């Protein structure tokens, strides 16, 4: 593998691998931040004599096009000149394998044919930072045995070198004669002239054209110092001084030449302008445009008499164009022909031809638009995250806090609605805290009441998800917003409705020739677009789905598009967004045909979404904040880019890294991860690891250590989207199925599959090696494509720890880099970071020595938004005590990953390897593992053995408390009772245990076991426990200090113990627990805290039956109920815990200690899941139907009954008042008849399947019979459930657990129907009793929340 160095004149050397022509070359080293269009870019004549450093880390994906083909004009069909014009090329990663429908060969082959040197494996970000702001950096690509000297190609006249040597004519026969002066013109200039009716006479740079006949003249170019082109400058000067009045249009070099000819000065810029995201402002009318630029010389801003500036650079104030005051002469410094780059300024060609066609010495101003007073807002109502919408069920969006922040900076008063009293959104005490908060449901009724009370003049309805949008739209339609004088801020409701209705949407798009059948196998691309009130419009992020709504593997930026495809879609995005009148943020999704330019629009979303959140996290561009400012009528150029500080929101980010997002499935998605790397492979393997700790990376092995079935149909597994498809792909490759076949079956673009094949080949290479034979080079490469020490250890036969030691002995370690939004074009002081093996330096200093706080990882069942609240509180406590903080998390749906709230944010893996990397590189003073759920807590001991100082409760004690055997022996000694239990190995040991304590029994890897047969199936180390029947469950949440409980709260589950404890509804304080049991609970907690020397948060769960109290388990960390308990009691338990763990003294006088609890007297609090849905055990271990749930709603009420009803309304349900479907197991009839009568006596009409209806009627409780879903149409007499739910006859379903395998399917269907129709579903008897009691006591709805003040 042949190597070479890039060597700069300042001494910098980087070693890389040759992929072009293997010979040395010297030139000016430059960088360009444009991501797309490398084939077009490297044929730009402006690069003559230059060694080009690419910002885009991943280069070569589309190979090289047909480089010999000509179009009808005799120009290169696919390129911008007749060959590669760069002197050399520097890239981070070169794709050897390419895949694109226009590709004819690899980029390397093309570079070899053209004799151009190129190396990969160099840190292009570091190069960019070195080159930046130093006028001319000279360098060379040097091969061993081929030494060269530094040379500056700008000292020769490069214009002359690239110019045509003879006159050439394009568009022969066309009616408008245009002379084009070739100073290194790009082909697209000619294409655009000819398309507009020009016969183009392309003349040499030094051709005396001054006496030629022509209708118009254009001067275009790229390379070199324009001052060396004196003969051309002289000739242009003769035109300027003659009586000739033909329009003159200068492009880039043309701006410099025209300016020089007129008497202006040029200089070499210390910071060149080279990218596709260069914002310019039209000085006359203030319109902004994104442009492509590639120039290193500029015009002095002091112009001679008769000339005026036309465009200015928004970032650096340099001239971007000029015009004559009265004659049709003008020029621009940027390239409106782009290729590559944004098609935003092509209208300048139209302008040119208009000047020619009119032809009475008009000015440029008169053939461009003229200049145009904004919305005045004193108080704004922001609709926060709310309850259920049909289809968008379980969605949450806390971006309203960024809106609050934006409004505050503009001195606008804020009112926020969010019904959850323990929401992270309302756990804010600074700039993100609303002036007034209403804890009311996001529904039209309640929103109307807040409007009456507060009289806001503005409403924000697009930052609280679907429910908030629907609520706002509904209020508009009813005339409520008009009646109270409330302006919808941002995109109007008319426009929103057009995006929400498919027909209206189709109609609107047809007015601009865009349209909308099967598009499976098409590439799915999305763009995030921002548009301000003044019609400025930028694309902030683009994304490509890897596989085949929002449950895909996604990468950003898109990887497999050409410039032409990317810019065509971008352009359409911008047109659609303008035509719809978007004022704010917008998401647009496209399907693109994989082997042509055909596309269509799938949808547009005019509210903040998952995509907009992903885009902000991926880019560092704060969409929600900016959208809120835009809603006040502030234009993009008047808003600051908070990452660079020095520039504005009016730009398109360039990324010098790649992002991978992967859904987290329940082991249909429950959460997501995002990883950052500088190869696809690094990003991708990281993201896979982030999903679950049992996933090693990209391998042919399944999560959770499961083995593949023996009857596996691999082709079938590939052709069906599922949560394990990625592992199946790895298997298919490993079993030597061709990539073409895999592509056919999966629709995954082959480019991604080549990367996946490369990972598997590295695994094979590693398996043949050992700790003595593996070279530095191979290990380096493995780490650069995302291999963990764990993966490597398995291949080499070592432990993880030995592998880490081996790697550090070779001094192979990762590097900390900033996400700066600009690919280092400008220095950033951002503290938003990631870690990569693909680099040669760190972007920050390591002098803070801060306190590390570990986040929770992806959300999933049992691990939700509650840990986000805990992180926020802990981080804030540290900051308020003046402690520096380092936060680590990889969950892009979290609020706590806010780089403004901590001093360093690492958006990184929560593995032992990566946490050690960060901790030791920062030399942190400590690490808090207690506030991020299970992930961080399981790392306690490993971290401790690797030099990490864990704060609070010792890791040795955590290990003891969570080892079941040791924990259980400690309880015995303390005389604290527990549920009898056993660890079993043999199936027979299970029967022996079950025998000695009776069925049913519980199982942990939590599932119930009714019979011995059922036990037999489950083993396809396992713990068995007996729970008592009819027990209550109680949670103890507490904070210990030196083994003493200094804060505690006891909550009672509504549900009897047994049905999973993590979706249980909690009541605080307790409702039906005896006083003696409470005392025993306290006493057991006292002893437990002392036995494990607790300093920090902890949780203990108990079974209570009468006076019997049994410990179930102890978690030596904060639990999901810490926020609930804190808000209910008026004391932040995390703040107390964080203080204890870092040794900050705390006053116990007013805390809820065991001796003096805090027990609310005037109110009760309830915590319930936000969303619940049924799941069928179709996997076939047992046939059963369970509920799963996620999210949180917490409310206060005078008692638990009114709290419960408030929680039902807060989740977005209507309190039932018409009819109830009753489904119960036959054996449960005697126990249910009482509640059935009670519901009926409240006026509910009862419905049930036939046998149950007959049973009710025979017991004098009236009931109407209905059909089992599987038996509909077998009896016309009986009505269908679906129909009765649709007519509104049934507005509540009770469906209690049912073991009868005959009706498990129907019961699942019934449950699914209730959920899909948005009506409350009760699946537990105690909950059902609570509901029946509550409707008895209650009335209407507004009365429950009636401005009650809750405290103490
Ligand atoms: Ni410029």
XYZ file of C-alpha atoms in Angstrom, residues 224-687:
464
model
C -4.769 33.160 -10.544
C -3.934 36.732 -9.771
C -6.092 38.926 -12.026
C -3.452 41.693 -11.941
C -1.176 39.549 -14.122
C -3.745 39.782 -16.965
C -2.859 43.324 -18.049
C -3.677 42.956 -21.764
C -7.195 41.862 -20.837
C -7.533 44.609 -18.240
C -6.481 47.110 -20.956
C -9.027 45.778 -23.446
C -11.861 45.946 -20.963
C -10.728 49.465 -20.081
C -11.098 50.482 -23.774
C -14.709 49.250 -23.698
C -15.441 51.117 -20.467
C -13.985 54.322 -21.997
C -15.653 53.980 -25.411
C -19.226 54.823 -26.413
C -20.107 51.101 -26.543
C -23.191 50.130 -24.488
C -23.543 46.345 -24.921
C -24.287 44.700 -21.612
C -21.275 43.395 -19.768
C -21.532 40.562 -17.256
C -18.522 39.543 -15.162
C -18.308 36.299 -13.210
C -15.692 35.848 -10.382
C -12.422 36.711 -12.179
C -14.732 38.884 -14.294
C -15.588 40.936 -11.210
C -11.855 41.489 -10.563
C -10.980 42.263 -14.179
C -13.937 44.635 -14.668
C -13.096 46.355 -11.349
C -9.423 46.662 -12.239
C -10.302 48.049 -15.672
C -12.486 50.690 -13.998
C -9.676 51.767 -11.612
C -10.374 49.693 -8.468
C -7.720 47.635 -6.615
C -7.425 43.926 -5.972
C -5.747 42.081 -3.111
C -5.055 38.478 -2.120
C -7.444 37.561 0.712
C -6.031 36.139 3.951
C -9.293 34.177 4.239
C -10.370 33.030 0.796
C -14.013 32.295 -0.073
C -14.289 28.670 -1.175
C -17.509 26.789 -0.576
C -21.119 26.286 -1.595
C -22.666 27.935 1.474
C -21.356 31.523 1.062
C -24.153 33.996 1.987
C -24.303 37.265 0.037
C -26.595 40.249 0.368
C -27.948 42.371 -2.457
C -27.127 45.845 -1.110
C -29.962 47.566 -3.019
C -32.879 45.490 -1.697
C -31.512 43.373 1.173
C -32.335 39.977 -0.393
C -29.979 37.197 0.699
C -28.693 34.323 -1.416
C -26.536 31.291 -0.788
C -23.756 31.073 -3.354
C -20.886 28.981 -4.598
C -17.559 30.718 -4.557
C -14.041 29.750 -5.318
C -11.755 32.773 -5.260
C -8.691 33.934 -3.317
C -8.400 37.463 -4.644
C -10.917 40.210 -3.957
C -11.823 43.727 -4.925
C -11.131 46.573 -2.537
C -14.415 48.045 -1.198
C -13.432 51.576 -2.306
C -14.712 51.800 -5.917
C -14.009 54.460 -8.554
C -16.524 57.096 -9.612
C -19.516 55.698 -11.532
C -19.330 52.233 -9.949
C -21.281 50.894 -6.987
C -21.282 47.681 -4.982
C -24.041 45.258 -5.907
C -23.498 42.327 -3.508
C -21.668 42.041 -0.172
C -20.549 38.967 1.790
C -22.615 38.592 4.959
C -19.867 36.824 6.958
C -16.747 38.853 6.149
C -18.044 42.098 4.485
C -15.947 41.598 1.286
C -17.145 42.791 -2.092
C -19.186 40.211 -3.964
C -20.128 42.231 -7.028
C -20.271 45.638 -8.670
C -22.343 47.644 -11.138
C -22.084 50.813 -13.166
C -24.463 53.587 -12.018
C -26.123 54.045 -15.477
C -24.647 51.584 -18.035
C -25.611 47.885 -18.284
C -22.287 46.693 -16.871
C -22.194 44.513 -13.784
C -20.341 41.622 -12.238
C -20.457 39.149 -9.410
C -17.684 37.503 -7.439
C -19.583 34.246 -7.019
C -20.577 31.627 -9.617
C -24.252 31.740 -10.554
C -23.675 28.818 -12.941
C -22.701 26.799 -9.825
C -22.029 23.137 -10.726
C -21.500 22.348 -7.961
C -23.583 24.521 -5.654
C -26.964 26.078 -4.971
C -29.126 27.080 -7.909
C -30.265 30.354 -6.251
C -28.670 32.988 -8.495
C -29.245 31.710 -12.016
C -31.685 34.617 -12.516
C -28.582 36.781 -13.162
C -28.397 35.123 -16.586
C -32.024 36.156 -17.241
C -31.031 39.696 -16.164
C -28.157 39.768 -18.609
C -30.422 38.827 -21.521
C -33.073 41.329 -20.401
C -30.465 44.111 -20.550
C -29.528 42.984 -24.037
C -33.141 42.697 -25.202
C -34.312 46.063 -23.774
C -31.108 47.797 -24.774
C -31.455 51.464 -23.875
C -28.584 51.620 -21.371
C -30.760 50.385 -18.540
C -29.202 49.656 -15.133
C -28.849 46.211 -13.554
C -31.104 47.365 -10.692
C -34.083 47.818 -12.988
C -33.979 44.152 -14.140
C -33.876 42.817 -10.545
C -36.636 43.192 -7.805
C -37.032 46.434 -5.705
C -36.992 46.886 -1.844
C -40.218 46.357 0.191
C -42.351 46.557 9.060
C -43.009 43.524 11.267
C -45.288 41.822 13.797
C -45.529 43.499 17.222
C -45.945 41.042 20.085
C -46.275 41.698 23.830
C -47.409 38.259 25.112
C -47.128 34.827 23.475
C -48.818 31.567 24.282
C -46.702 28.532 23.604
C -48.385 25.157 23.411
C -46.086 22.620 24.981
C -45.915 18.869 24.675
C -49.329 17.248 25.005
C -51.571 14.199 24.852
C -52.456 11.727 22.121
C -53.208 12.336 18.471
C -54.602 9.476 16.367
C -51.575 7.980 14.553
C -48.924 10.200 16.176
C -49.409 8.304 19.459
C -46.650 8.541 22.117
C -44.965 11.556 20.463
C -43.345 14.189 22.730
C -41.710 17.482 21.811
C -40.044 19.861 24.308
C -38.789 22.406 21.725
C -41.193 24.982 23.202
C -38.461 25.817 25.736
C -36.259 27.138 22.943
C -39.215 29.268 21.883
C -39.517 30.581 25.458
C -35.812 31.410 25.312
C -36.115 33.247 22.003
C -39.115 35.298 23.197
C -37.357 36.298 26.436
C -34.379 37.706 24.514
C -36.820 39.915 22.593
C -38.645 41.026 25.786
C -41.816 39.179 24.901
C -43.803 37.757 27.809
C -44.372 34.036 27.702
C -47.135 31.703 28.773
C -46.563 27.967 28.407
C -49.022 25.097 28.657
C -47.911 21.574 29.611
C -50.161 19.340 31.738
C -47.354 17.186 33.205
C -46.285 18.589 36.587
C -42.999 16.623 36.463
C -42.080 17.486 32.883
C -38.510 18.314 32.036
C -39.900 21.199 29.944
C -41.096 23.012 33.083
C -38.040 22.081 35.191
C -36.317 25.300 34.110
C -35.302 28.312 36.176
C -33.428 30.566 33.736
C -33.912 31.903 30.227
C -35.906 28.785 29.312
C -38.462 29.302 32.072
C -41.781 30.761 30.922
C -43.142 33.761 32.828
C -46.358 31.870 33.488
C -46.991 28.101 33.290
C -50.419 26.473 33.114
C -50.527 22.778 33.879
C -53.583 22.142 31.706
C -54.322 19.653 28.901
C -53.531 20.744 25.369
C -57.134 20.725 24.125
C -59.317 23.498 22.563
C -61.427 23.924 25.692
C -58.430 24.463 28.024
C -56.405 26.487 25.575
C -59.437 28.760 25.201
C -59.527 29.295 28.995
C -55.851 30.302 29.086
C -56.444 32.757 26.231
C -59.363 34.340 28.161
C -57.251 34.582 31.314
C -53.945 35.843 29.833
C -55.069 37.623 26.667
C -51.988 36.788 24.653
C -51.667 38.605 21.316
C -49.538 35.773 19.819
C -49.729 31.975 19.618
C -47.020 29.421 18.813
C -48.634 26.102 17.787
C -45.914 24.246 15.860
C -43.526 23.313 18.693
C -45.609 20.869 20.732
C -46.091 18.072 18.217
C -49.237 17.010 16.418
C -51.651 17.485 19.278
C -50.671 21.131 19.751
C -50.881 21.737 16.003
C -54.378 20.215 15.797
C -55.463 22.199 18.819
C -54.289 25.494 17.336
C -55.854 24.733 13.940
C -59.141 23.832 15.584
C -59.206 27.132 17.514
C -58.537 29.072 14.313
C -61.418 27.262 12.547
C -63.898 27.931 15.366
C -63.136 31.681 15.301
C -61.658 31.673 18.804
C -58.310 33.182 17.760
C -60.063 35.934 15.800
C -62.466 36.685 18.641
C -59.642 37.198 21.163
C -57.201 38.938 18.766
C -54.571 36.204 18.847
C -52.215 36.089 15.866
C -50.842 32.744 14.804
C -47.094 33.457 14.723
C -45.097 31.849 11.949
C -46.669 29.804 9.198
C -50.370 30.631 8.857
C -53.106 28.092 9.535
C -54.189 28.271 5.881
C -50.725 27.078 4.850
C -50.550 24.423 7.566
C -53.902 22.971 6.506
C -52.596 22.748 2.953
C -49.735 20.521 4.174
C -51.967 18.388 6.441
C -54.561 17.516 3.795
C -53.369 15.348 0.948
C -55.847 16.709 -1.618
C -55.211 20.396 -0.828
C -51.521 19.590 -0.795
C -51.722 17.994 -4.241
C -53.695 20.979 -5.546
C -51.184 23.525 -4.232
C -48.198 21.644 -5.678
C -49.802 21.475 -9.131
C -49.826 25.292 -9.283
C -45.996 25.096 -9.600
C -45.758 21.877 -11.690
C -44.894 19.508 -8.839
C -46.889 16.312 -8.300
C -47.251 13.058 -6.339
C -48.344 4.445 -6.908
C -45.366 2.516 -5.539
C -41.973 4.102 -4.815
C -40.446 1.154 -2.938
C -36.743 0.851 -3.742
C -36.507 4.566 -4.466
C -34.025 6.576 -2.449
C -35.631 8.500 0.405
C -34.101 11.882 1.007
C -35.264 14.638 3.319
C -34.368 18.277 3.743
C -34.856 20.661 6.628
C -35.676 24.104 5.294
C -35.933 27.414 7.085
C -37.730 30.437 5.537
C -38.021 33.876 7.129
C -40.715 36.550 6.680
C -38.580 38.389 4.069
C -38.502 35.290 1.799
C -34.869 34.315 2.645
C -34.744 30.578 2.491
C -31.965 28.122 3.439
C -31.525 24.368 3.610
C -30.083 23.432 6.946
C -29.677 19.660 6.691
C -30.263 16.768 4.334
C -30.595 13.103 5.190
C -30.675 9.794 3.387
C -32.493 6.740 4.630
C -30.235 3.669 4.486
C -33.089 1.121 4.686
C -36.879 1.058 3.975
C -41.916 5.916 8.298
C -39.474 7.300 10.888
C -38.024 3.924 11.820
C -35.136 3.903 9.360
C -31.411 3.940 9.735
C -30.603 7.466 8.538
C -27.338 9.163 7.673
C -26.579 12.848 7.368
C -25.472 14.233 5.069
C -26.826 12.180 2.232
C -24.047 10.040 0.736
C -25.135 8.595 -2.604
C -26.369 11.669 -4.586
C -24.707 13.569 -7.359
C -24.622 17.367 -7.370
C -27.327 17.416 -10.019
C -29.666 15.257 -7.912
C -28.900 17.063 -4.648
C -29.416 20.536 -6.128
C -32.511 19.613 -8.104
C -34.173 18.426 -4.842
C -32.852 21.405 -2.881
C -34.254 23.741 -5.429
C -37.652 22.050 -5.337
C -37.591 22.202 -1.553
C -37.109 25.931 -1.646
C -39.803 26.476 -4.269
C -42.317 24.358 -2.380
C -41.523 26.119 0.873
C -42.018 29.571 -0.716
C -45.231 28.621 -2.464
C -46.717 27.224 0.793
C -45.772 30.399 2.710
C -43.673 28.649 5.383
C -42.406 31.133 7.928
C -40.208 29.051 10.191
C -38.926 25.516 9.826
C -40.102 22.875 7.377
C -39.303 19.264 6.589
C -39.719 17.892 3.091
C -39.366 14.245 2.056
C -38.607 12.988 -1.387
C -38.521 9.677 -3.165
C -35.836 9.666 -5.851
C -35.590 7.026 -8.544
C -32.303 5.137 -8.015
C -31.195 5.190 -11.697
C -32.523 8.454 -13.146
C -33.616 12.008 -12.185
C -37.294 11.126 -11.613
C -38.583 12.019 -8.172
C -41.627 12.893 -6.240
C -42.567 14.632 -3.045
C -43.820 12.322 -0.302
C -44.726 14.938 2.259
C -44.134 18.216 3.920
C -44.202 18.881 7.642
C -44.682 22.454 8.759
C -44.163 21.835 12.493
C -41.136 20.715 14.467
C -40.684 16.951 14.257
C -38.285 14.087 14.962
C -36.430 15.078 11.807
C -36.017 18.684 12.850
C -34.693 17.523 16.232
C -32.281 15.131 14.520
C -31.156 17.888 12.171
C -30.367 20.306 15.015
C -28.371 17.682 16.877
C -26.575 16.550 13.729
C -25.578 20.063 12.613
C -25.458 22.245 15.730
C -27.991 24.570 14.061
C -30.696 25.454 16.676
C -33.824 25.152 14.539
C -36.443 25.637 17.232
C -34.849 28.821 18.619
C -34.374 30.270 15.147
C -37.891 29.337 14.119
C -39.223 31.180 17.160
C -37.236 34.329 16.216
C -38.464 34.056 12.626
C -42.044 33.924 14.005
C -41.477 37.452 15.369
C -40.688 38.605 11.810
C -36.915 38.784 12.341
C -34.980 37.905 9.157
C -32.223 35.270 9.115
C -29.315 37.663 8.546
C -30.357 39.562 11.733
C -30.120 36.407 13.900
C -26.799 35.098 15.360
C -25.290 31.547 14.764
C -24.813 30.537 18.403
C -21.949 28.054 17.679
C -19.539 30.398 15.793
C -20.808 33.588 17.515
C -19.417 35.716 14.651
C -21.881 34.790 11.886
C -25.646 34.636 11.383
C -28.426 32.076 11.013
C -28.412 32.834 7.267
C -26.183 30.004 6.050
C -26.133 26.307 5.209
C -24.036 24.146 7.520
C -21.086 22.213 6.141
C -20.393 18.939 8.021
C -16.858 17.481 8.130
C -18.204 14.289 9.722
C -21.097 11.899 9.153
C -24.028 11.190 11.431
C -25.896 7.924 11.799
C -29.246 7.600 13.477
C -30.686 4.200 14.352
C -34.017 3.397 15.965
C -34.014 1.603 19.301
C -36.425 -1.277 19.155
C -38.123 -3.039 21.964
C -35.801 -6.024 22.578
C -42.900 0.541 16.228
C -39.631 1.927 17.727
C -39.330 3.172 21.310
C -36.307 5.512 20.983
C -33.259 6.343 18.905
C -29.526 6.910 18.980
C -27.299 9.210 16.987
C -23.575 8.698 16.442
C -20.894 10.862 14.842
C -17.804 9.568 13.029
C -15.600 10.630 10.160
C -16.097 7.436 8.215
C -19.454 5.814 7.573
C -18.081 2.712 9.309
C -17.049 4.501 12.522
C -20.415 6.276 12.791
C -22.403 3.172 11.978
C -20.722 0.698 14.334
C -20.890 3.285 17.104
C -24.607 3.825 16.576
